[PDB]
Design a protein around this ligand. Sequence first.
Ligand SMILES: *[C@@H]1O[C@H](CO)[C@@H](O[C@@H]2O[C@H](CO)[C@@H](O[C@@H]3O[C@H](CO[C@H]4O[C@H](CO)[C@@H](O)[C@H](O)[C@@H]4O)[C@@H](O)[C@H](O[C@H]4O[C@H](CO)[C@@H](O)[C@H](O)[C@@H]4O[C@H]4O[C@H](CO)[C@@H](O)[C@H](O)[C@@H]4O)[C@@H]3O)[C@H](O)[C@H]2NC(C)=O)[C@H](O)[C@H]1NC(C)=O
Ligand SMILES: *[C@@H]1O[C@H](CO)[C@@H](O[C@@H]2O[C@H](CO)[C@@H](O[C@@H]3O[C@H](CO)[C@@H](O)[C@H](O)[C@@H]3O)[C@H](O)[C@H]2NC(C)=O)[C@H](O)[C@H]1NC(C)=O
Ligand SMILES: *[C@@H]1O[C@H](CO)[C@@H](O[C@@H]2O[C@H](CO)[C@@H](O[C@@H]3O[C@H](CO)[C@@H](O)[C@H](O)[C@@H]3O)[C@H](O)[C@H]2NC(C)=O)[C@H](O)[C@H]1NC(C)=O
Ligand SMILES: *[C@@H]1O[C@H](CO)[C@@H](O[C@@H]2O[C@H](CO)[C@@H](O)[C@H](O)[C@H]2NC(C)=O)[C@H](O)[C@H]1NC(C)=O
Ligand SMILES: *[C@@H]1O[C@H](CO)[C@@H](O[C@@H]2O[C@H](CO)[C@@H](O)[C@H](O)[C@H]2NC(C)=O)[C@H](O)[C@H]1NC(C)=O
Ligand SMILES: *[C@@H]1O[C@H](CO)[C@@H](O[C@@H]2O[C@H](CO)[C@@H](O)[C@H](O)[C@H]2NC(C)=O)[C@H](O)[C@H]1NC(C)=O
Ligand SMILES: *[C@@H]1O[C@H](CO)[C@@H](O[C@@H]2O[C@H](CO)[C@@H](O)[C@H](O)[C@H]2NC(C)=O)[C@H](O)[C@H]1NC(C)=O
Ligand SMILES: *[C@@H]1O[C@H](CO)[C@@H](O[C@@H]2O[C@H](CO)[C@@H](O)[C@H](O)[C@H]2NC(C)=O)[C@H](O)[C@H]1NC(C)=O
Ligand SMILES: *[C@@H]1O[C@H](CO)[C@@H](O[C@@H]2O[C@H](CO)[C@@H](O)[C@H](O)[C@H]2NC(C)=O)[C@H](O)[C@H]1NC(C)=O
Ligand SMILES: *[C@@H]1O[C@H](CO)[C@@H](O[C@@H]2O[C@H](CO)[C@@H](O)[C@H](O)[C@H]2NC(C)=O)[C@H](O)[C@H]1NC(C)=O
Ligand SMILES: *[C@@H]1O[C@H](CO)[C@@H](O[C@@H]2O[C@H](CO)[C@@H](O)[C@H](O)[C@H]2NC(C)=O)[C@H](O)[C@H]1NC(C)=O
Ligand SMILES: *[C@@H]1O[C@H](CO)[C@@H](O[C@@H]2O[C@H](CO)[C@@H](O)[C@H](O)[C@H]2NC(C)=O)[C@H](O)[C@H]1NC(C)=O
Ligand SMILES: *[C@@H]1O[C@H](CO)[C@@H](O[C@@H]2O[C@H](CO)[C@@H](O)[C@H](O)[C@H]2NC(C)=O)[C@H](O)[C@H]1NC(C)=O
Ligand SMILES: *[C@@H]1O[C@H](CO)[C@@H](O[C@@H]2O[C@H](CO)[C@@H](O)[C@H](O)[C@H]2NC(C)=O)[C@H](O)[C@H]1NC(C)=O
Ligand SMILES: *[C@@H]1O[C@H](CO)[C@@H](O[C@@H]2O[C@H](CO)[C@@H](O)[C@H](O)[C@H]2NC(C)=O)[C@H](O)[C@H]1NC(C)=O
Ligand SMILES: *[C@@H]1O[C@H](CO)[C@@H](O[C@@H]2O[C@H](CO)[C@@H](O)[C@H](O)[C@H]2NC(C)=O)[C@H](O)[C@H]1NC(C)=O
Ligand SMILES: *[C@@H]1O[C@H](CO)[C@@H](O[C@@H]2O[C@H](CO)[C@@H](O)[C@H](O)[C@H]2NC(C)=O)[C@H](O)[C@H]1NC(C)=O
Ligand SMILES: *[C@@H]1O[C@H](CO)[C@@H](O[C@@H]2O[C@H](CO)[C@@H](O)[C@H](O)[C@H]2NC(C)=O)[C@H](O)[C@H]1NC(C)=O
Ligand SMILES: *[C@@H]1O[C@H](CO)[C@@H](O)[C@H](O)[C@H]1NC(C)=O
Ligand SMILES: *[C@@H]1O[C@H](CO)[C@@H](O)[C@H](O)[C@H]1NC(C)=O
Ligand SMILES: *[C@@H]1O[C@H](CO)[C@@H](O)[C@H](O)[C@H]1NC(C)=O
Ligand SMILES: *[C@@H]1O[C@H](CO)[C@@H](O)[C@H](O)[C@H]1NC(C)=O
Ligand SMILES: *[C@@H]1O[C@H](CO)[C@@H](O)[C@H](O)[C@H]1NC(C)=O
Lengths: 53, 43, 453, 133
Amino acid sequence: INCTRPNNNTRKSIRIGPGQAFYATGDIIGDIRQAHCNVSKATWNETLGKVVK
Amino acid sequence: NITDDMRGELKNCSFNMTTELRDKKQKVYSLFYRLDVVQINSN
Amino acid sequence: AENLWVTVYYGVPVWKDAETTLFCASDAKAYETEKHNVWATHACVPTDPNPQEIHLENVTEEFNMWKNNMVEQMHTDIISLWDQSLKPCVKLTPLCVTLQCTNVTNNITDDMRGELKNCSFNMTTELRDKKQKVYSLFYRLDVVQINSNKEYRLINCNTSACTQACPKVSFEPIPIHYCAPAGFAILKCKDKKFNGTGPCPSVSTVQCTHGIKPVVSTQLLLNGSLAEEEVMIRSENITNNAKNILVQFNTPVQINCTRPNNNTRKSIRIGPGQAFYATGDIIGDIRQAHCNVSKATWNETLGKVVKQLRKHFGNNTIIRFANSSGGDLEVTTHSFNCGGEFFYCNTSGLFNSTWISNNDSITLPCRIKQIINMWQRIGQCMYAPPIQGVIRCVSNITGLILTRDGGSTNSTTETFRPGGGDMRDNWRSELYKYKVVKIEPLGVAPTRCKRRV
Amino acid sequence: AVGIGAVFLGFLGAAGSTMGAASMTLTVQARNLLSGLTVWGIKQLQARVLAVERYLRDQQLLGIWGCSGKLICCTNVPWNSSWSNRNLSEIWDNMTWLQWDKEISNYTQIIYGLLEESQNQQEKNEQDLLALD
Ligand SMILES: *[C@@H]1O[C@H](CO)[C@@H](O[C@@H]2O[C@H](CO)[C@@H](O[C@@H]3O[C@H](CO[C@H]4O[C@H](CO)[C@@H](O)[C@H](O)[C@@H]4O)[C@@H](O)[C@H](O[C@H]4O[C@H](CO)[C@@H](O)[C@H](O)[C@@H]4O[C@H]4O[C@H](CO)[C@@H](O)[C@H](O)[C@@H]4O)[C@@H]3O)[C@H](O)[C@H]2NC(C)=O)[C@H](O)[C@H]1NC(C)=O
Ligand SMILES: *[C@@H]1O[C@H](CO)[C@@H](O[C@@H]2O[C@H](CO)[C@@H](O[C@@H]3O[C@H](CO)[C@@H](O)[C@H](O)[C@@H]3O)[C@H](O)[C@H]2NC(C)=O)[C@H](O)[C@H]1NC(C)=O
Ligand SMILES: *[C@@H]1O[C@H](CO)[C@@H](O[C@@H]2O[C@H](CO)[C@@H](O[C@@H]3O[C@H](CO)[C@@H](O)[C@H](O)[C@@H]3O)[C@H](O)[C@H]2NC(C)=O)[C@H](O)[C@H]1NC(C)=O
Ligand SMILES: *[C@@H]1O[C@H](CO)[C@@H](O[C@@H]2O[C@H](CO)[C@@H](O)[C@H](O)[C@H]2NC(C)=O)[C@H](O)[C@H]1NC(C)=O
Ligand SMILES: *[C@@H]1O[C@H](CO)[C@@H](O[C@@H]2O[C@H](CO)[C@@H](O)[C@H](O)[C@H]2NC(C)=O)[C@H](O)[C@H]1NC(C)=O
Ligand SMILES: *[C@@H]1O[C@H](CO)[C@@H](O[C@@H]2O[C@H](CO)[C@@H](O)[C@H](O)[C@H]2NC(C)=O)[C@H](O)[C@H]1NC(C)=O
Ligand SMILES: *[C@@H]1O[C@H](CO)[C@@H](O[C@@H]2O[C@H](CO)[C@@H](O)[C@H](O)[C@H]2NC(C)=O)[C@H](O)[C@H]1NC(C)=O
Ligand SMILES: *[C@@H]1O[C@H](CO)[C@@H](O[C@@H]2O[C@H](CO)[C@@H](O)[C@H](O)[C@H]2NC(C)=O)[C@H](O)[C@H]1NC(C)=O
Ligand SMILES: *[C@@H]1O[C@H](CO)[C@@H](O[C@@H]2O[C@H](CO)[C@@H](O)[C@H](O)[C@H]2NC(C)=O)[C@H](O)[C@H]1NC(C)=O
Ligand SMILES: *[C@@H]1O[C@H](CO)[C@@H](O[C@@H]2O[C@H](CO)[C@@H](O)[C@H](O)[C@H]2NC(C)=O)[C@H](O)[C@H]1NC(C)=O
Ligand SMILES: *[C@@H]1O[C@H](CO)[C@@H](O[C@@H]2O[C@H](CO)[C@@H](O)[C@H](O)[C@H]2NC(C)=O)[C@H](O)[C@H]1NC(C)=O
Ligand SMILES: *[C@@H]1O[C@H](CO)[C@@H](O[C@@H]2O[C@H](CO)[C@@H](O)[C@H](O)[C@H]2NC(C)=O)[C@H](O)[C@H]1NC(C)=O
Ligand SMILES: *[C@@H]1O[C@H](CO)[C@@H](O[C@@H]2O[C@H](CO)[C@@H](O)[C@H](O)[C@H]2NC(C)=O)[C@H](O)[C@H]1NC(C)=O
Ligand SMILES: *[C@@H]1O[C@H](CO)[C@@H](O[C@@H]2O[C@H](CO)[C@@H](O)[C@H](O)[C@H]2NC(C)=O)[C@H](O)[C@H]1NC(C)=O
Ligand SMILES: *[C@@H]1O[C@H](CO)[C@@H](O[C@@H]2O[C@H](CO)[C@@H](O)[C@H](O)[C@H]2NC(C)=O)[C@H](O)[C@H]1NC(C)=O
Ligand SMILES: *[C@@H]1O[C@H](CO)[C@@H](O[C@@H]2O[C@H](CO)[C@@H](O)[C@H](O)[C@H]2NC(C)=O)[C@H](O)[C@H]1NC(C)=O
Ligand SMILES: *[C@@H]1O[C@H](CO)[C@@H](O[C@@H]2O[C@H](CO)[C@@H](O)[C@H](O)[C@H]2NC(C)=O)[C@H](O)[C@H]1NC(C)=O
Ligand SMILES: *[C@@H]1O[C@H](CO)[C@@H](O[C@@H]2O[C@H](CO)[C@@H](O)[C@H](O)[C@H]2NC(C)=O)[C@H](O)[C@H]1NC(C)=O
Ligand SMILES: *[C@@H]1O[C@H](CO)[C@@H](O)[C@H](O)[C@H]1NC(C)=O
Ligand SMILES: *[C@@H]1O[C@H](CO)[C@@H](O)[C@H](O)[C@H]1NC(C)=O
Ligand SMILES: *[C@@H]1O[C@H](CO)[C@@H](O)[C@H](O)[C@H]1NC(C)=O
Ligand SMILES: *[C@@H]1O[C@H](CO)[C@@H](O)[C@H](O)[C@H]1NC(C)=O
Ligand SMILES: *[C@@H]1O[C@H](CO)[C@@H](O)[C@H](O)[C@H]1NC(C)=O
């Protein structure tokens, strides 16, 4: 199974107190797309067949 | 620059935050996913 | 005598090197109240009034002063005790606030110009609704300008929040004895000319070490132990200039230090059951703090040190002393704690001389601080409350820590400068004659005795 | 009584003496092997536990060799000259236990197994003999 988050994220540091930081999300460098996962259809079908048997 | 499936899944929020000094405050902004925020009752 | 058989003996005197956990043991007299001490001897087992030591004849043992685990254990224990003593004390979070400071010019000498500031700020009260306006005196080493009566802030506001030291606890060092568990032992080297490494021909065994006072300082070892015969120079590798040199004196050298200011203390309530001890006005004149040593005594001691140093560099070499090179204030100055306050003296008049192959006093100006970073850590500071009245203390100089400059070829000149920093070298100057061993009371040997069936 | 008439006695007192002389003071070392949430909270407990474990581990070995409750125990395993060919006079009158340990440190594990198997055989034979009656 292959999974990915296809967004180039940017991090920010915000000082909210003495020696304390909160890490925020800045802007996204590029396009915005959904995250997903991939599996092979044939392999999954074979495994499901064995499970059913 | 978003697709049709990522519509409304991200929000651009701004808020007042405390500083290292107890007297003054700062105005900041950050991006939050729509699954982490709740409306309370444009922008 | 050829029909020899194995025979088993239990309780033979043999041992091996080992690393284990030692435990403290304080004196009984420390239990007479005085529970207010950073070194929590409340949990330390009482010591034996009559310690026992056994002499080991004909035994020769190998010591290595620079690979001793006792030093690491002592360092960790000291740090842990220091941290533990500060947990039930006030946390000065609300003190990180904009200040409005101005110079203190009121009956001051020409050397104390710009060293004190008079600051005022808004502070929280016991009630969550209202606030109060207060003022206090801060040393110039604790404030930073941010961009008349310009505005400042405490130096530590952008790294962490300081913890105020509880005013009842005392910093006075107390002797401590380290003891080994059952099945282990501590060996001691009784040789008077031991140089910290190699075989010691005179040995003995004890169960606890002598009382060791945890004195914290740099460039100078105070209230320590003295050598019996001559000044001792010890180093891991004398020919390498990246290794420090430890010097143990033959006789003590007295040093007098004082803070000649009559200080006043104020109590400010910053919350429910919480107080911040500020500094009020100074009752009288304002003058710098300093320390005194005798010129003749220092000259004699330096002469002896030079005489003992030429044995590793030849009789026709020039030896000269220079002050520290550079770094932070905690490394280029002789730091120490004198009855609550923390000093940083300028030991530049001591190491100023050159020696050929052939009444008065020295005054060392000193500064003071209130935000302390111990153990060379980052992110943990401490605030020292002010002390009321004048301060004076006396102690002995027992040793030194030096460093050599890498010179080209043999220029016939060697320059040594003071240098401290790591506090493990302070412990190493006391635990240099001890080591821990593990007993193995099982042995087999041949004999003519045979078991009866 | 005057006992053995020694100048003084103490823990590890005879470390630098010949193995013959050091063998008369085994009790001195034997009796000192058992007792002789703050920072100092567990530094006192773990040490005690470790001491107890070491003592029991040492006792078990004597137990399985048939030498329980003894300070000097004779065995039935002959000495092998490969371990050491030195005389019986230059061992008990010209060497110390510290030196001896170094010489035979390699063959210690070899000797231990023979002592176990000999005791096993002895116990089996004794059981058979008693069964015969
Ligand atoms: C190397 O070794 C030397 C000697 O061991 C050491 O110097 C000694 O330092 C200690 C610690 O500062 C000194 O002990 C203090 O002494 C002062 C001065 O009092 C002296 O004179 C009176 C009258 O003659 C004697 O009775 C007394 O014994 C002293 O000789 C005392 O004022 C100190 O007591 C105060 O501090 C204690 C610890 O904090 C408190 O427990 C005690 O209750 C006192 O505080 C209370 O009273 C204060 C004054 O009213 C008040 O301000 C407080 O808020 C609180 O209410 C303490 O006993 C000792 O005298 C030094 N010895 C010499 C010979 O000078 C060096 O410091 C050491 N070197 C290093 C680097 O550590
Ligand atoms: C962060 O803090 C700032 C400053 O405290 C907040 O801004 C303030 O928001 C209030 C809410 O509306 C403003 O009051 C209104 O002002 C308008 C314009 O003057 C007036 O017509 C209304 O009747 C009402 O009084 C206030 O003026 C404003 N202050 C400033 C300096 O802009 C802000 O809302 C806080 N939150 C965020 C996310 O920034
Ligand atoms: C402690 O808190 C007090 C009260 O909050 C602070 O005083 C306030 O300081 C501000 C900063 O200048 C003042 O605003 C200015 O007022 C002047 C005079 O009215 C005006 O001309 C300026 O345009 C500006 O608005 C404010 O008036 C003042 N409030 C009071 C009641 O005096 C103070 O600065 C805080 N810090 C310290 C160290 O006291
Ligand atoms: C995600 O964005 C960062 C920042 O824009 C990219 O990092 C830069 O990549 C460029 C490539 O042209 C380099 O020249 C820069 O030195 C990189 N660091 C910067 C700009 O700070 C990163 O390559 C992007 N990752 C992608 C697109 O997969
Ligand atoms: C997972 O599968 C998807 C398709 O099911 C892959 O998406 C393709 O990605 C390539 C490279 O970016 C594009 O050229 C194709 O157009 C994409 N297919 C589409 C849009 O249908 C994806 O690369 C696979 N890998 C991962 C990690 O998800
Ligand atoms: C999941 O990702 C892996 C990458 O490690 C893919 O394995 C590669 O598949 C390509 C097919 O286009 C081969 O050419 C590569 O040799 C493979 N790499 C390795 C290391 O074996 C895998 O195919 C992906 N699976 C799915 C279902 O997308
Ligand atoms: C911004 O996004 C919101 C959704 O987060 C849009 O508002 C509607 O919200 C409801 C409730 O979740 C959804 O069912 C609708 O699909 C959303 N869209 C519409 C058109 O009703 C809102 O329209 C978006 N745009 C603005 C300007 O707020
Ligand atoms: C989220 O909103 C912030 C503003 O609240 C955006 O940041 C500003 O964008 C404008 C428009 O280009 C710039 O002129 C400003 O300099 C930006 N910074 C500030 C502090 O205003 C930010 O781009 C928004 N993010 C997204 C993803 O829309
Ligand atoms: C108050 O003290 C400050 C110093 O804390 C004086 O300002 C100067 O500060 C610089 C930077 O450290 C020094 O090099 C100067 O020697 C200081 N003095 C002068 C005259 O420049 C300041 O002058 C003092 N007086 C006032 C009224 O602020
Ligand atoms: C530090 O400044 C404060 C004021 O902020 C001084 O205290 C005031 O001094 C004036 C002048 O004598 C008096 O009239 C006031 O009664 C004092 N108290 C207050 C609350 O204003 C203080 O003297 C200054 N300290 C130094 C050393 O200069
Ligand atoms: C401390 O004395 C020991 C000897 O007791 C020194 O170690 C010997 O140093 C010489 C050369 O100086 C070597 O040849 C020997 O092999 C060393 N012996 C051992 C056992 O290490 C040691 O150098 C001396 N250290 C100082 C700083 O004087
Ligand atoms: C003690 O220090 C000296 C000097 O640093 C070491 O001698 C050097 O050894 C290196 C080998 O790593 C050589 O490259 C240098 O030429 C040597 N310098 C001199 C002046 O001899 C010496 O090895 C160190 N002692 C130990 C035990 O490491
Ligand atoms: C430091 O100042 C305090 C307070 O002024 C002095 O303590 C007072 O000394 C006088 C002496 O005339 C006594 O009458 C008072 O009873 C003392 N307590 C007070 C005023 O609260 C102290 O003597 C000064 N110390 C010096 C100058 O060394
Ligand atoms: C340390 O030495 C200094 C001088 O080097 C001493 O200062 C003298 O103190 C007395 C008494 O207050 C004055 O009469 C002298 O005028 C001072 N000498 C000067 C100003 O040169 C000091 O007393 C000594 N003691 C301490 C503890 O520092
Ligand atoms: C450091 O202070 C001590 C105070 O205890 C000084 O010792 C005194 O010195 C004077 C000399 O004027 C003698 O009259 C006293 O008898 C000494 N007192 C004691 C208890 O011995 C010492 O001289 C000072 N040393 C320096 C270098 O200033
Ligand atoms: C430590 O003290 C020495 C000597 O007092 C300081 O060096 C002197 O600094 C002054 C200026 O403050 C110069 O006028 C002198 O010329 C310097 N001495 C010499 C021999 O040149 C030294 O700066 C002090 N250390 C500090 C301040 O960190
Ligand atoms: C440290 O040594 C230097 C150098 O000897 C002293 O500085 C002056 O040096 C010149 C000649 O180089 C002499 O004529 C002066 O007499 C020296 N100064 C004084 C006050 O006599 C310096 O005095 C020494 N002390 C320090 C730096 O504290
Ligand atoms: C500092 O050194 C002095 C002088 O060596 C020490 O004073 C001696 O202390 C012992 C033990 O109490 C006495 O038996 C001696 O009689 C003292 N010497 C004199 C000349 O009286 C002192 O103990 C050392 N430690 C300090 C000052 O903390
Ligand atoms: C999966 O495999 C079975 C037999 O293994 C086959 O009949 C079927 O067409 C395949 N595809 C799906 C979607 O089941
Ligand atoms: C120090 O003592 C030496 C001899 O011990 C002497 O030559 C010298 O003048 C004295 N003074 C200084 C400052 O070295
Ligand atoms: C003695 O030991 C040697 C090797 O250590 C071995 O070769 C020899 O057989 C042994 N002899 C015995 C156990 O009698
Ligand atoms: C061991 O005994 C033999 C035979 O008695 C003798 O020759 C030899 O010298 C002895 N070696 C010693 C005592 O070291
Ligand atoms: C023990 O064996 C090691 C090799 O395993 C050897 O180096 C050493 O010399 C031996 N010791 C004796 C006393 O024979």
